[PDB]
């Protein structure tokens, strides 16, 4: 459950991401593929090579949805219903993977927002990605 500080923290942090969210999306994916090679099992149809247009493109998509969730930090369940749908009934990504992308997203933010990645912001972002994770895997069964 995101506290008022958390939502603030999250909103602040993502605010700085700005025009780079897409790039950060892409980079996180890249870090996940490299660090947790099992995650690649879900993208057999992509070119996973460095700077592949497929990864870039996809990075954008992930970034944009994250953005959308920060904006509806208050109504996540509702803001991401379609996405919860897609993942649960179409994609069928196993739940463990959500923790892997989440972690890689922290790492990426850490690496690019030195000043804003304080211990309190770190905790908030973590809880946020966890919340996003829960929403996205809530219609699994």
């Amino acid at each position: 459950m995101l506290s008022p500080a958390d939502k603030t923290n999250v909103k602040a942090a993502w605010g700085k991401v700005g025009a780079h969210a897409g790039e950060y999306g892409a980079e996180a994916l890249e870090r996940m593929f490299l660090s947790f090679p099992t995650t690649k099992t879900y993208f057999p149809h992509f070119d996973l090579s460095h700077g592949s247009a497929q990864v870039k493109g996809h990075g954008k998509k992930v970034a944009d949805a994250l953005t959308n969730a920060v904006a509806h930090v208050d109504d996540m369940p509702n803001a991401l219903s379609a996405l919860s749908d897609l993942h649960a009934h179409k994609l069928r990504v196993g739940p463990v993977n959500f923790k892997l992308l989440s972690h890689c997203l922290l790492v990426t933010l850490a690496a690019h927002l030195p000043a804003e990645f304080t211990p309190a912001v770190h905790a908030s972002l973590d809880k946020f990605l966890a919340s996003v994770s829960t929403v996205l895997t809530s219609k699994y069964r």
């Binding site: 090679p37 099992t38 099992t41 649960a88 069928r92 196993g94 463990v96 699994y140 069964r141």
Partner: protein, 146 residues
């Protein structure tokens, strides 16, 4: 695996009583039913819409017997699982693209199935030996992923 001799004997005694045909079908069906996401890999199997549809699907039963067949083989080479499972590991990764976490879920389902089947015979310590074993197999099956 870290199987004491007495763990190894207990694994083997019990396994002697198992009907791989049936246990195999039961474990695989139960996996598709308890963790519906694992169905992604068997869209060509047909109707998996309800529990009766999965448990009784001849394709699920057949596959399950195949999987547990490969598993019993593993039980005879408890000394060299990575070895035993190398080609299968490569297949699951490279051709099938099966997320290796699926192998640990199957492990747990199987332990419930053995509990289901042997009742009291499945003692606390017999389960501890099987836990080691299914963990070993899942590791072996994931060893070749890249």
């Amino acid at each position: 695996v870290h199987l004491t001799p007495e763990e190894k004997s207990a694994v083997t005694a019990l396994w002697g009583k198992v009907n791989v045909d049936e246990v195999g079908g039961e474990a695989l069906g139960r996996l598709l039913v308890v963790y519906p996401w694992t169905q992604r890999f068997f869209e060509s199997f047909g109707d998996l819409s309800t529990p009766d549809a999965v448990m009784g699907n001849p394709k699920v039963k057949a596959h399950g017997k195949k999987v547990l067949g490969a598993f019993s083989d593993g039980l005879a080479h408890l000394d060299n699982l990575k070895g035993t499972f190398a080609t299968l590991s490569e297949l699951h990764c490279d051709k099938l693209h099966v997320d290796p976490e699926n192998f640990r879920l199957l492990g747990n389902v199987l332990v419930c199935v053995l509990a289901h089947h042997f009742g009291k015979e499945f003692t606390p310590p017999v389960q501890a030996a099987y836990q080691k074993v299914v963990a070993g197999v899942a590791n072996a099956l994931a060893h070749k992923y890249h």
